[PDB]
């Protein structure tokens, strides 16, 4: 019974450390990017007025 209890504790600890590591690595990755079809241009003349 004590062996089963400590095995459950070890399993809980390893799954918890896996979860915290996964959350940590996810929390820093560059998930989304902004692609630029046309970058900002440098105007030569004035469009307005």
């Amino acid at each position: 019974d004590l062996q089963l209890q400590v095995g459950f504790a070890e399993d809980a600890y390893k799954l918890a450390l896996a979860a915290v590591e996964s959350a940590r690595i996810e929390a820093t990755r560059k998930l989304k990017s902004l692609v630029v079809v046309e970058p900002p241009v440098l105007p030569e003349i004035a469009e307005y007025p």
């Binding site: 004590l2 209890q5 400590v6 504790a9 070890e10 809980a12 600890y13």
Partner: peptide, 14 residues
């Protein structure tokens, strides 16, 4: 929880 379980196991070994 793991610390408490290990403490119980090492206490009941004797």
């Amino acid at each position: 929880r793991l610390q408490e379980a290990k403490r119980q196991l090492i206490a009941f070994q004797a």
